[PDB]
Ligand SMILES: Cc1cc2nc3c(=O)[nH]c(=O)nc-3n(C[C@H](O)[C@H](O)[C@H](O)COP(=O)(O)OP(=O)(O)OC[C@H]3O[C@@H](n4cnc5c(N)ncnc54)[C@H](O)[C@@H]3O)c2cc1C
Ligand SMILES: Cc1cc2nc3c(=O)[nH]c(=O)nc-3n(C[C@H](O)[C@H](O)[C@H](O)COP(=O)(O)OP(=O)(O)OC[C@H]3O[C@@H](n4cnc5c(N)ncnc54)[C@H](O)[C@@H]3O)c2cc1C
Ligand SMILES: COc1cc(OC)c2[nH]c(=O)cc(C)c2c1OC
């Protein structure tokens with residue numbers, strides 16, 4: 001029945017390590033016969049700000065602007081900006097969404113934060129029933145593929161940065177799990193810049209390798225225990 | 231001495247609950263005789279995207295664009311875009327920085343994430359070495375004044391969202407502490423959209439009342455234990 005993959009990609013430089021990782025995911029998932037689409041946010045000059053431009057025609061309450069309410073009603077009334085709905089159509093059709101980004105301040109770059117803020121609107125991604133286990137994107141897989149400046153040692157529990165999993169919580173749980181995604185284990189490529197050449201080649205190779213059996217994987221249990229506990 | 235306060239404010243609607251919490255801070259700090267400046271991000275149409283437009287000089291490596299490297303050298307050389315250096319002057323002069331924002335996906339709205347990505351560059355906010363307790367903003371205070379959709383109850387260890395302190399980690403530790411700020415306890419105003427008129431007025435006056443004695447507070451111990459316990 002085939003599978004559709006969306007890669008949401010947030011790097012300014014096509015020759016970057018992130019670009020290589022995105023390119024390998026494209027090469028390998030396309031080799032398997034999957035339908036692959038990439039949202040190259042910087043190349044699209046993707047709008048990160050949540051503003052009233054995100055609603056076309058006339059606001060639900062033009063006196064006091066409430067982004068959440070107005071985007072909810074806009075979704076229901078098919079009245080959202082086309083950049084947003086173009087993205088929601090790719091997500092709707094995806095079986096798997098991979099986010100490929102460098103870690104910026106223990107989180108996603110603002111351009112990709114703006115994608116999550118604007119694309120994952122109430123009525124599309126969640127509503128009152130239909131959050132966490134029940135969220136509107138249930139059935140879909142999501143996966144963070146993150147590159148870091150810090151070596152793997154810095155990201156241990158008693159290290160300076162604390163555990164990798166500590167920063168994962170707002171993205172995996174607060175965002176992806178909230179919307180119904182099952183979350184595969186994050187791919188974390190530690191510290192590509194302090195190399196080496198061969199060691200960079202090796203991390204790109206390992207991601208490609210993992211993508212081979214991505215469809216065999218089980219989701220993580222997306223829990224406070226998984227992130228912080230023992 | 232007296233003191234300088236910068237409020238970095240991220241809400242689209244001046245009549246909003248965020249609007250009121252920013253306005254009471256300006257009013258109370260101004261009443262005390264403090265110097266007060268507000269960076270009203272949406273009104274400034276503040277650029278959230280980290281791009282090569284943020285550097286105007288000869289790039290250190292114009293064949294492969296690396297945002298961290300290029301902004302660090304642009305800072306030393308003074309070729310950063312001026313919107314960034316305008317913010318930096320505000321932070322440099324400040325004794326206290328307050329971030330006033332609605333929680334968006336367990337984090338800051340993208341427009342304010344872009345402020346942290348672009349303004350807190352290497353050379354200015356931190357160096358290597360020169361971070362966490364050696365951060366370049368040592369001696370300044372910071373405070374997150376966050377509003378939520380979820381109730382206090384929802385943000386407890388056994389509630390749907392887990393403890394409120396879990397989502398504070400990337401912002402308090404990975405960003406502010408990393409830059410050397412001493413972090414004051416977060417002001418979290420839970421679920422104003424749900425709350426009654428009296429409860430909302432109550433939340434605004436509790437912030438006003440807290441600001442009366444802010445200069446007397448000790449910072450939090452910004453550690454994994456404060457954040458996750460326990
Ligand atoms: C605003 C900001 C905030 C940040 N916050 C954090 C943080 O909170 N925590 C943290 O750890 N880090 C942080 N960083 C560091 C950041 O996460 C790293 O800079 C980034 O992940 C490096 O990945 P890259 O793709 O840009 O590396 P690149 O510099 O693009 O790649 C490294 C090398 O790989 C080469 N390359 C590309 N493809 C290949 C290939 N196939 N094989 C071999 N070599 C290849 C490149 O040419 C380059 O020499 C931050 C950086 C910035 C700018
Ligand atoms: C993209 C997105 C992501 C989100 N992610 C999360 C999340 O991860 N977790 C979560 O909990 N929530 C989330 N939310 C919900 C969001 O945090 C809240 O909607 C926001 O915190 C509420 O603050 P506000 O200023 O917008 O409230 P408002 O809607 O502006 O205020 C509520 C009421 O208070 C009134 N008010 C204004 N001033 C005063 C005053 N002086 N005295 C008394 N009343 C006053 C207003 O008139 C209004 O009637 C998200 C929302 C969006 C849009
Ligand atoms: C803002 O840039 C940041 C922020 C960080 O932590 C918050 C970082 N932590 C690390 O362990 C290693 C690096 C390199 C790093 C970094 O820049 C390269």
Ligand SMILES: COc1cc(OC)c2[nH]c(=O)cc(C)c2c1OC
Nearest residue numbers: 174175178335336379380381384391
């Ligand atoms: C995407 O918007 C979000 C995301 C959330 O958690 C991620 C939320 N959690 C809550 O507890 C309560 C609310 C209102 C909420 C919210 O607004 C609808």
Ligand SMILES: [Zn+2]
Nearest residue numbers: 173177222223
């Ligand atoms: Zn979860």
Ligand SMILES: [Zn+2]
Nearest residue numbers: 403407452453
């Ligand atoms: Zn800390």
